[model samples]
Target: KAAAIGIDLGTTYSCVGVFQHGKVEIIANDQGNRTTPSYVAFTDTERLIGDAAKNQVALNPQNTVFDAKRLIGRKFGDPVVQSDMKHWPFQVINDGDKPKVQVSYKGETKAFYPEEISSMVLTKMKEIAEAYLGYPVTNAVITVPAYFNDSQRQATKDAGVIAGLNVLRIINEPTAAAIAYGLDRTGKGERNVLIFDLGGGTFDVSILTIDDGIFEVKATAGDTHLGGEDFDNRLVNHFVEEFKRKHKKDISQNKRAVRRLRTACERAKRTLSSSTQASLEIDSLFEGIDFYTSITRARFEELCSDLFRSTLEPVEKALRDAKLDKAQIHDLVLVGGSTRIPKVQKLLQDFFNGRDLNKSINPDEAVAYGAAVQAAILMG
Candidate 1:
């Protein structure tokens, strides 16, 4: 039951989909979820992947690796790796001039290449598809950020190959979103689309034009370091300071305390999207001190206002490269979970002078669905 499918190898979570019966559908995992966490953990006797790995990350910080996409095919001398060394709790070491991850399992330390770690996630995706299709699925089209360089894209393809998959194509994330938006639509006039994709760990913006079934990408830009995770970090750091002030003790150095705060911060971020305020409570957050706090939507926005503004410069950059003003864009499409924030939506609205954005597609699944569409076309 081999089948060609599409995979969204996202920074925080990964998704798989297949094209069938003239349409595309997302393939859910064994737990019936459409997406799985892109995380891996090593233990004494076994390797854990996806949700299982993510669930245990706080408990085994040093042995767990997430965000492997950022490290893949990068050298130790790369500036990005240097930044990673400061935040990533996992051990990242130098293998000559290249970067490698080190972790201990069963009292023995082992080092891994970023591509190898990515392969584990890719292999899991392949098996997920095979299990769902009831056959040996081998071919796929993977999606990446529109702004990814040649090296990053090639590294992604290498991960697929290592996972025993034939990576048929590596499409831009925005292009995939556009495919999902344009599918089966009867249109004639030239329409402009500004795809704003803000995922867990990356932000990408692309301007595209479609006329009579033809889609052309005019420009693309974004930052790899800006996304929902950064927003969460802002909140986490803010709370850490507050906690130290209230309790007269700093828990910043405690890994477990920071992990708890991060988890709570993420929940607060999601809650504040719809509610006027969000309340976070962590039992024994640090040394049996029950931490409780509430942040108003306004305050949360104030803290990360600069972060929100950062997304706009890329918008301007894309429009500049396309040599067009914002007024020319007929449809501003929002893709990725981070766009769910109320402030992000309002900001874009103001930037476009109250222009209406595309609300027809699910932000979370649009890219994966579009990837499925491409996979079907490639297989055909």
Candidate 2:
């Protein structure tokens, strides 16, 4: 049978899943990574995607395209795009009213629409699923942030088509999480669930009601520009300043150095999620000088404290839109990679009056799993 797969095509990472043998299986790429990096790179002879593409980012920062999800379906003159382009090493040029990424590929300059770049990533995901299932895959259900506009959804569908996928559906990310949660407790009676999804590049909080086997979204709210990447940027800026003060060198203008530092800072941020302290060491960060730094969890939280606090705004907004009180929420389902942060979890717990959060499902895989479930239902 041709497998119908579910894809969580995220800004920083992506996951593919399939419902098989009465259970959902999250497919791993050839690199054995459960979540493949949503990066694409072009070289002299070949194009690369996922881990291979991300690995060479330091060397080909301008050619490596990541975070295409942020620009998809957005206008060139959008304020968000204007602000985001400043941090990117790759060039984003205005093509008419659309934003297009310009990069060197195969000894020639090439420009790609965000949808095209995203299609390359989707193609990689399809290949991953084909390799895993040992079967041809065409039908898929893709998850996106709940707040994505109609154009964004349509652009995503176009990407899927360009990737040679028959996109069966485009489901909301937080709603997919709720579906995954509801699948496990079908007869648990009607309950209100709040999904707090903080991924690598976006944030969404959705309130849903699960009754019997049906799920309805009461309300949703989010910020497109807020996520783990912002947290990493905070650390990167702090260290960049520390380096300037100690070594009297300003490497902020050095694109390659800044990209390498961002990678290290992101790693440190992940470590801080589970440990009290994390050390960052970068060899020859700039002008043949190594950079070494360590940060405690407390310090890391302090640096991004405002960002952490800001996540609550959407939660409040969703609650207001849903016309429900915090106490009315029965379950708190976490979604996306950034939800693993200790501070995020602590703040969410405090906001919910210390109610136990539902950590029963893997946060990173939940959305994909639910998408797969939807695919399976459609197939039947």
Candidate 3:
């Protein structure tokens, strides 16, 4: 069958899914990973996407483009873009009013629109689905942040076209999660649900009413720059200072060293989720020096206390916008990878007065799964 797939084209990672055999299957990439890193790299001889692109970030910082989702459909002069550009290794030049990423490819300097970069990622997802389904895949439903404006949504659709996909729909990330959640429950009457989605690069809270099989989104709120990456960055900053203190030398100016340290910090962040303490070790980090450090869960929470608190604000705002109280939210569902963090889960549970959050769905794959359901419906 020529399947219509669903894609979660995320900031830090991307995923593809399809409905088959009366269930949703999340497609794995050639690397055999269910989720692919949303990275694109250009070398003198070839272009790379997903894990291959992410693997060489330190070796090709300026030519590797990650997190392009942050700049899509936004002007170069936008405050958010300006703030984010300071941290990006790749250069963003003003192309008319929009931002264009400049990189070296094929021994030539070239600049690409954010849509072009996103299209490359979408294309990779399309190929993955085609390989798994044993047929050509052209139609898809892509998920985006709920807070995305008209321009951002349109830009996403354009990227789909560039990837050779007939985008059947551009669905909200939280809404897609809601669809996946609603389908799994056995209840009959109306139910009020709250979806708390915190991913690698963004956070979203949505309040919706599920009546039988129908779903209505009442409100949505989130921080575009709040997610697991921000938490990792906190660790990165702390380690950079620690390295300077221990070695009496600054490696902050070294982009490659900083990138390596960032990767290490990100890994440690994941470790702290499952263990009380996580270690960071890097050999020849900079100036032929080795660096080692460890962080406890307590310290990690303290470092990101403000960010953790910030997530609650959107939850409150969503409830307020929906004109509902916390108790009225019958079921609170968790979505996105960041929700797996124990502190985040604890804070959310505390906010809701110890109510149990729904964790039945895989946070990383739920949105794509919901998207696949939508694609299947559209195809039928």
The clash count of every prediction, one per candidate, is 0, 0, 0
lDDT of 2 by residue, 1-380 (tens): 68799999998899999999999999888878889999999888779999999999888888899989989999999998999999887999999999999999999999999999999999998988898888889899998877789999999999999999999999988778877876436676888888888888888888988788677879989887888889999999999999998899999999889989999999999999889999999999999999998899999999999999999999999999999999999888988899999899999999899988787889999998899988998888
TM-score leaderboard ranking: 3, 2, 1
Taking the tens digit of each residue's C-alpha lDDT, what string does model 3 give over 1-380?
Answer: 47799999998999999999789999989889999999999999999999999999899988999998998878899998999999888999998889999999999999999989999999999999988888889899998887788988999899999999899999988778877875435558888888888998888888888787677889989987788988989998999899989889889899889889999999999898899999999999989999987889999999999999999999999989999989998888898888889999999999999987776889989899899998998999
Give the Å error, residue 317, model 3. 1.6
The true-versus-predicted C-alpha distance at residue 356 of model 1, in Å, is 2.0
Instruction: Please list the C-alpha lDDT of all candidates, in the order they appear.
Output: 0.88, 0.90, 0.90
* Model 2 misplacement above 4 A: 77-83, 94-96, 183-189
Q: Model 3 lDDT vs. the true structure?
A: 0.90
Q: What's each prediction's TM-score?
A: 0.92, 0.93, 0.94
Scored by Cα lDDT, where does model 1 land?
0.88
**Runs in model 3 lying further than 4 Å from the true structure:** 76-79, 183-189
User: Model 1: how far is 132 from its true place, Å?
Assistant: 2.5
* Candidate 1 stretches greater than 4 Å from native: 183-190, 211-215
Give candidate 2's TM-score: 0.93
